[PDB]
Design an enzyme around this catalytic site. Structure first.
Site, PDB file in Angstrom:
ATOM      1  N   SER A  99       0.803  -1.219   0.000  1.00 17.70           N
ATOM      2  CA  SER A  99       0.000   0.000   0.000  1.00 17.70           C
ATOM      3  C   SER A  99       0.844   1.282   0.000  1.00 17.70           C
ATOM      4  CB  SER A  99      -0.940  -0.002   1.207  1.00 17.70           C
ATOM      5  OG  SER A  99      -1.754  -1.167   1.208  1.00 17.70           O
ATOM      6  N   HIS A 135      16.647  22.930  12.255  1.00 22.45           N
ATOM      7  CA  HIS A 135      16.144  21.720  12.907  1.00 22.45           C
ATOM      8  C   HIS A 135      15.822  20.690  11.853  1.00 22.45           C
ATOM      9  CE1 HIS A 135      14.427  19.311  16.136  1.00 22.45           C
ATOM     10  NE2 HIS A 135      13.390  19.041  15.355  1.00 22.45           N
ATOM     11  N   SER A 137      14.569  16.568  11.539  1.00 17.44           N
ATOM     12  CA  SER A 137      14.076  15.358  12.184  1.00 17.44           C
ATOM     13  C   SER A 137      13.179  14.641  11.194  1.00 17.44           C
ATOM     14  CB  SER A 137      13.277  15.716  13.434  1.00 17.44           C
ATOM     15  OG  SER A 137      12.108  16.423  13.084  1.00 17.44           O
ATOM     16  N   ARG A 140       9.326  10.602  12.998  1.00 15.96           N
ATOM     17  CA  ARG A 140       9.007   9.267  13.497  1.00 15.96           C
ATOM     18  C   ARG A 140       9.033   9.235  15.016  1.00 15.96           C
ATOM     19  NH1 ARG A 140       7.527   5.443   9.205  1.00 15.96           N
ATOM     20  NH2 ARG A 140       7.265   7.197   7.760  1.00 15.96           N
ATOM     21  N   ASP A 177      18.620  10.532  19.691  1.00 13.73           N
ATOM     22  CA  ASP A 177      18.108   9.614  18.671  1.00 13.73           C
ATOM     23  C   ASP A 177      19.256   9.110  17.803  1.00 13.73           C
ATOM     24  OD1 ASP A 177      15.359   9.833  19.406  1.00 13.73           O
ATOM     25  OD2 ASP A 177      15.155  11.687  18.243  1.00 13.73           O
TER      26      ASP A 177
END
Ligand code: BOG
Ligand code: BOG
Ligand code: BOG
Ligand code: BOG
Length: 262
Positions: A99, A135, A137, A140, A177
């Site tokens: 999908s 910034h 990112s 997620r 992260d």
């Protein structure tokens, strides 16, 4: 007011040009949408996704990038407090089995103090001096959440058919992260563009001279029309995207483009 001429490739100067329709936006970086074929579809990092097992190597890659002049003259004529929004997306379009998922999207907004300038470097001209907050990112959530923040300076200089843009940055805030992201992204970005008639040849990359990791992106575009170009791209190395910041890969893709670096 604001004197600085059009100057192709000059972001700030272009931002200083005023339009009538307030909904006419300015470009910042390049805007394209190309069909690509990667050499390694990093599914190890996107393992948590329940389609990772079906990740295909051919994705649709597009980049959107606009500038918003928030306040011209905040520091004299030909200066602007501005903002930008650049978004790069990798979209498993052909993977309809799953999908058509998006494997990754990096959102990077910028708030900056920019200047259109005129500085003689022996043939070259230092056209854009810009420095602001960045910034970046991927929106997620753990475990596939990636993000970092940078204070930076953008310099643009052109010498006829040549264009050079260096962008050194200093990292600020959190980087949990991806703690070692600098091992892969280094301390700056270099853009070289060259005009061969209407053909534009370009290179964008970063390399951490210490760790020897890095990434590069070569590209060639040509007019299909006044506004749209045919664009070919060959990215190779670490850092193509946040989710693959510490992943190496060679990606060749072909599509359309609006603006090139100049
Ligand atoms: C136009 C399609 O929009 C896309 O929708 C996706 C849905 O998750 C987002 O991840 C992408 O960032 C967005 O560009
Ligand atoms: C490091 C901060 C960037 C300095 C940019 C401020 C913009 C000032 O503007 C500069 O003033 C100079 C006069 O000294 C002129 O020669 C330059 O053409 C002009 O761009
Ligand atoms: C938490 C996110 C706050 C984002 O705020 C940023 O913090 C930076 C810190 O050096 C400042 O330099 C930037 O101007 C500011 O936009
Ligand atoms: C990387 C781009 C290489 C640009 O190279 C340039 O190509 C021009 C066209 O042939 C020549 O006229 C110039 O001498 C040369 O510097």
């Amino acid at each position: 007011v604001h004197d600085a001429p059009a100057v192709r490739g000059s972001i700030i100067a272009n931002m200083l040009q005023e339009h009538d329709n307030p909904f006419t936006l300015y470009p910042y970086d390049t805007n394209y949408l190309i069909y690509t074929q990667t050499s390694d579809l990093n599914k190890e990092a996107i393992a948590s996704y329940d389609w990772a097992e079906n990740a295909r190597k051919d994705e649709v890659k597009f980049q959107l990038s606009l500038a918003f002049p928030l306040w011209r003259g905040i520091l004299g004529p030909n200066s602007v407090l501005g903002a930008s929004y650049t978004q790069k997306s990798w979209w498993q379009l052909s993977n309809s089995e799953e999908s058509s998922p998006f494997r990754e999207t990096n959102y990077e907004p910028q708030l900056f103090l920019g200047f259109a300038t005129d500085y003689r470097f022996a043939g070259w001209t230092l056209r854009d001096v810009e420095m602001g907050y960045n910034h970046d990112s991927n929106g997620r959530s753990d475990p596939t959440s990636r993000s970092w923040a940078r204070l930076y300076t953008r310099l643009m200089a052109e010498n006829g058919n040549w264009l050079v843009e260096v962008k050194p940055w200093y990292v600020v805030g959190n980087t949990d992260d991806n703690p070692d992201i600098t091992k892969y992204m280094g301390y700056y970005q270099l853009k070289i563009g060259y005009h061969l008639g209407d053909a534009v040849l370009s290179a964008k990359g970063q390399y951490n001279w210490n760790t020897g990791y890095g990434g590069a992106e070569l590209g060639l575009s040509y007019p299909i029309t006044k506004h749209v170009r045919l664009y070919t791209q060959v990215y190779s190395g670490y850092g193509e995207s946040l989710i693959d910041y510490n992943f190496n890969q060679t990606r060749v893709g072909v599509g359309v483009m609006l603006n090139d670096l100049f």
